[PDB]
């Protein structure tokens, strides 16, 4: 509703931590923030041969999960915009605010 | 399947246009085995490099849609 967040990360611990940060500092100055809704956690898969020259019949498999989290804000106020676009922690987590 | 106009090379077509006037020479020596045999190549004698040498091929009329590489093989069996 005319303001909403999106957060991607590789660790759900950091993800939930920052989601609680934003939810708390949002409902401190406003009201009615839709919960941190979870999204379905994309996954990839990489198979590789673990030997430099021969032996195709023995491999090692890797992956990279990407956790997702959604937060929608209802009825912002000329102070929520301020108190939201300023908090920034932590480092390796993607934030994308679309109106 | 180049239904957007068949394919010659500029050097090859330049040479053939240049000799189009009079009776022709056997010295048209090009590598160019990708080119097709336009209906103006008749009567000449093209030299087609086969990876080792320059084979001459005399262009009759029945050979008018094929390529210049179809008349100079490369493998040498028996």
């Amino acid at each position: 509703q005319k303001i909403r967040i999106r957060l991607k990360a590789y660790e759900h611990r950091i993800l939930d931590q920052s989601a609680d940060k934003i939810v708390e500092t949002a409902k401190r100055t406003g009201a009615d923030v839709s919960g941190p809704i979870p999204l379905p956690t994309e996954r990839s898969l990489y198979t590789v041969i673990r030997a430099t020259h021969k032996y195709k019949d023995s491999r090692e498999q890797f992956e990279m999960r990407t956790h997702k989290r959604l937060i929608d804000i209802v009825n912002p106020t000329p102070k929520t915009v301020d108190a939201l676009m300023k908090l920034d922690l932590p480092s390796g987590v993607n934030i994308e605010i679309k109106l | 399947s180049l239904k957007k106009g068949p394919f010659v090379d500029d050097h090859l077509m330049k040479k053939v246009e240049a000799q189009q006037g009079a009776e022709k020479k056997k010295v048209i020596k090009t590598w160019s085995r990708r080119s097709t045999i336009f209906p103006s190549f008749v009567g000449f004698t093209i030299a087609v490099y086969d990876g080792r040498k320059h084979v001459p091929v005399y262009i009759q009329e029945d050979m008018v849609g094929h390529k210049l590489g179809e008349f100079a093989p490369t493998r040498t069996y028996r």
Binding site: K8, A9, Y10, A51, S91, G92, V93, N94 | -
Partner: protein, 204 residues
């Protein structure tokens, strides 16, 4: 070849990535920039005994932190060397960089430090049997549940290669909640290359 890398078996379980940034559609460039960075700063490391390096990055700045055992001999007199580190790293990354230097405590309980030090004796014509023994002796006195070392190659600067190491205390490898450390270095005396490996168990 029948053992897994002990700090790749445990990454994403009890330890973290030494590179913590999230990016998409700018991922190859970032990974090779980190590689360039880390392959460069092995310049001062040649003397200052650095162990790890942690790369984070923001909108256009790059936050770096390095763990060393020589704080003054890496920052300068009054701050005249970190200046150079930043003004040199800007020439590569073309961004703003901010080194935040950490200092390491108990440096004898670190795999890269120990192994790299006991792989510098081999170059100075020292016998290997007592290098490893004194290494594990000065690693146990700092207080450690177990340690294991191993050297390989043409020993004594001699003919056909062999291998041998020494163990002290327990070093359980199959336990996933173990917090072990590991590193692999190289050196030469005059013949070929040697490989030194070191594992230290520091509780969980």
């Amino acid at each position: 070849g029948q053992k897994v890398h002990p700090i790749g078996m445990r990454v994403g379980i009890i330890r973290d990535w030494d590179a913590k940034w999230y990016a998409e559609k700018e991922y190859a460039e970032f990974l090779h920039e980190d590689l360039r960075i880390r392959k460069f700063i092995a310049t001062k490391l040649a003397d200052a005994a650095v162990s790890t390096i942690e790369i984070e990055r923001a909108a256009n700045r790059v936050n770096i932190s390095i763990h060393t055992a020589k704080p003054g001999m890496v920052i300068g007199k009054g701050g005249s060397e970190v200046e150079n580190l930043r003004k040199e790293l800007n020439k590569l990354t073309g961004k703003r960089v901010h080194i935040n230097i950490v200092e390491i405590k108990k440096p004898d309980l670190d795999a890269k430090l120990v192994g790299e030090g006991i792989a510098r004796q081999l170059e100075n014509r020292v016998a290997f049997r007592r290098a490893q023994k004194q290494a594990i002796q000065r690693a146990m006195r700092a207080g450690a549940k177990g340690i294991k070392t191993q050297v390989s190659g043409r020993l004594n600067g001699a003919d056909i290669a062999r291998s041998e190491g020494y163990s002290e205390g327990t070093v359980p490898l199959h336990t996933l909640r173990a917090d072990i450390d590991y590193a692999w270095e190289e050196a030469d005396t005059t013949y070929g290359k040697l490989g030194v490996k070191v594992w230290i168990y520091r509780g969980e």
